[PDB]
Design a protein around this ligand. Structure first.
Ligand SMILES: [Cu+2]
Ligand SMILES: [Cu+2]
Ligand SMILES: [Cu+2]
Ligand SMILES: [Zn+2]
Lengths: 151, 151
């Protein structure tokens, strides 16, 4: 596919629509997320597109190369590590990311996987503790959705 | 990849969980759907995994070979034509299908697409009007979900 979409929903008020478009050897990720607390919120692709137990069954970060967690500009990061989105005072986060590791086809394809927006900021693997190098200390999963093929 | 799952939801009481597993050279579809009216209900793979407008944005039946609608055992059918599921008096439908045209990888892959359960029976392209050749006269989309990768 050349284009994909994901609608984020959860048990709280957070919701959003994320769009993905292949451009060159990158994916451009755009959209908006509402109902967030102002500030940064971790934003990752998780491994499974399984919503049978809400966002908990999505599993860990998508990591086909078996690396530690990092920020999107790091050499050592999960494929699913897209850093943070920032919500304003009204709870609105505008998403505008360009990433060369995620793909919409082939081995690193994210189609059929899950996008998750988290409770806290992602510390980008520089938190100093062990959880930092697994999840970035981003905490709970506020909302999630399976990434589907779009027109 | 080898296993997929879809959680069906809508605006009504209809809900369900569908599992997909590549066994040998075919795909086995199993699960159950609840909240249905007794009788047959059309059960199809629609093209887009886009739920921004509920099940409406899923588009038409997945049809890479550009054929008319039919039943699962016909030569002339859409790839997404999985026939009907049958609900008992309690509104429960058990899904147990083996299909040769769908896949979980490659050109026929349904990963990232949408599973839909419809309001009425699918007439299998035999109703005699133009609509029969598109949707089987299966009617409204009661519940749907995006098909994601499972563990
Ligand atoms: Cu995460
Ligand atoms: Cu990570
Ligand atoms: Cu249909
Ligand atoms: Zn059809």
């Amino acid at each position: 596919a050349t284009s994909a979409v994901c609608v984020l929903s959860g048990d709280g008020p957070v919701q959003g629509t994320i769009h993905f478009e292949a451009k060159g050897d990158t994916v451009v990720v755009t959209g908006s997320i509402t109902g967030l607390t102002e500030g940064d919120h971790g934003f990752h692709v998780h491994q499974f597109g399984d919503n049978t137990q809400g966002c908990t069954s999505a599993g860990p970060h998508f990591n086909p190369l078996s690396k530690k967690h990092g920020g999107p500009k790091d050499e050592e990061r999960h494929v699913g590590d897209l850093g943070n989105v920032t919500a304003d005072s009204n709870g609105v986060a505008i998403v505008d990311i360009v990433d060369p590791l995620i793909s919409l086809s082939g081995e690193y394809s994210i189609i059929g996987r899950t996008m998750v927006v988290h409770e806290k900021p992602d510390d980008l693997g520089r938190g100093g503790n062990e959880e930092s190098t697994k999840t970035g200390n981003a905490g709970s999963r506020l909302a999630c959705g399976v990434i589907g093929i779009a027109k």
